[PDB]
Design an enzyme around this catalytic site. Structure first.
Site, PDB file in Angstrom:
ATOM      1  N   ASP A   1     -34.448  10.298 -14.238  1.00 30.37           N
ATOM      2  CA  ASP A   1     -33.755   9.713 -13.090  1.00 30.37           C
ATOM      3  C   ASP A   1     -34.731   9.500 -11.932  1.00 30.37           C
ATOM      4  O   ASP A   1     -35.042  10.442 -11.192  1.00 30.37           O
ATOM      5  CB  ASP A   1     -32.635  10.653 -12.668  1.00 30.37           C
ATOM      6  CG  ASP A   1     -31.864  10.145 -11.484  1.00 30.37           C
ATOM      7  OD1 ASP A   1     -32.034   8.965 -11.154  1.00 30.37           O
ATOM      8  OD2 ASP A   1     -31.068  10.920 -10.906  1.00 30.37           O
TER       9      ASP A   1
ATOM     10  N   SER B   1     -37.122  -6.521  -2.524  1.00 29.58           N
ATOM     11  CA  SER B   1     -37.136  -7.730  -3.327  1.00 29.58           C
ATOM     12  C   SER B   1     -37.187  -8.950  -2.412  1.00 29.58           C
ATOM     13  O   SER B   1     -36.673  -8.937  -1.290  1.00 29.58           O
ATOM     14  CB  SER B   1     -35.880  -7.773  -4.206  1.00 29.58           C
ATOM     15  OG  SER B   1     -35.750  -9.009  -4.889  1.00 29.58           O
TER      16      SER B   1
END
Length: 330
Positions: A35, A199
């Site tokens: 994770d 992004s």
């Protein structure tokens, strides 16, 4: 040193991925959920409340000659999906894919919430976010990657998750045969303890690319892709009959649909998520309403590039002095 381990979807939907981990002496192999959105290595154990164990493999520290109680240490964690676990702490030898760390904090669960009990395939979590998020008190502990870093050939790990197929976590090296083209690296903020990056925009299907900054986290422990409501609405508007359902808890779409791809920007590069990766199947057995793999982050407080996004790429988690993230197509 290096390590290399195969990671395998837990079910036919890729709801999560499990990677075998050797703990203790002799080794006890547990299948852990790696994770990158948390920083605790915790396991089902011989200390876990018996009624809360249902098929998981447990770590028994009393059977490990290298286990040592970390005196006074406790841990307690809550995850974004509302699940939680807590317990005490041992140090022991932990190996992943041939890479060994001695003295790793292994957090033994005394209690786990129902969603962990109900998932017999996940024996615990191995956190790979920054150690500043580790919950052990009163002495915070380091992640497996942080402990291994100095010994690695290069201070990196990579995630290569499969679509409906196994993939690979590598530590200490970048397998140049595992991706196409070049790896585009992008800046990371560690201020929230995550692999947080920005992004450069998105496209829906064959549509034009929208240049817009989307701050979010690369999180292998989250199944879906959670993005701003504007972006998610633009995606699902291209699917006839798709709608946001308050009763189901997100966007659903007709199971008869063919889904468009979704592209996200990494600098000037582009990662294309095929439409099929966005299908999470019937909302309940036999239903013709299917659950979408791109959902709004509006209620979270952060955008999450979970498995739906990451499995479309070869992803480098660069733990150099200034961390960065790399993405390549594959």
């Amino acid at each position: 040193s290096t390590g290399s381990a195969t990671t395998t979807p837990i079910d036919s939907l890729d709801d999560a991925y499990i990677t075998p981990v050797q703990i203790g002496t002799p080794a006890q192999t547990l299948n852990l959920d790696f994770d990158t959105g948390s920083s605790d290595l915790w396991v089902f154990s011989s200390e876990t409340t018996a009624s809360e164990v249902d098929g998981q493999t447990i770590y028994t520290p009393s059977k490990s000659t290298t286990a040592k109680l970390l005196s006074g240490a406790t841990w307690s964690i809550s995850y974004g999906d509302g699940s939680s676990s807590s317990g005490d702490v041992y140090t022991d030898t932990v190996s992943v894919g041939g890479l060994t760390v001695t003295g790793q904090a292994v957090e033994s669960a005394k209690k786990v919430s129902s969603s962990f009990t109900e998932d017999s395939t996940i024996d615990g979590l191995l956190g790979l976010a920054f150690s500043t998020l580790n919950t052990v008190s009163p002495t915070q502990q380091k992640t497996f990657f942080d402990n291994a870093k100095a010994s690695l050939d290069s201070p990196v790990f990579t995630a290569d998750l499969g679509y409906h197929a196994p993939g690979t976590y590598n530590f200490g090296f970048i397998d140049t045969t595992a991706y196409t083209g070049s790896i585009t690296y992008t800046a990371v903020s560690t201020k929230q303890g995550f692999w947080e990056w920005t992004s450069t925009g998105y496209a829906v299907g064959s549509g034009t690319f929208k240049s817009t900054s989307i701050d979010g986290i690369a999180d292998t422990g989250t199944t879906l892709l959670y993005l701003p409501a504007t972006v998610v609405s633009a995606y699902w508007a291209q699917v006839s009959g798709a709608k946001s359902s308050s009763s189901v808890g997100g966007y659903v779409f007709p199971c008869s649909a063919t889904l468009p791809s979704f592209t996200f920007g990494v600098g000037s590069a582009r990662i294309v998520i095929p439409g099929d990766y966005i299908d999470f199947g019937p909302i309940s057995t036999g239903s013709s309403s299917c659950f979408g793999g791109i959902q709004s982050s509006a209620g979270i407080g952060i955008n999450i590039f979970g498995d739906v996004a990451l499995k479309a790429a070869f992803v480098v988690f660069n733990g150099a002095t200034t961390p960065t993230l790399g993405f390549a197509s594959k």
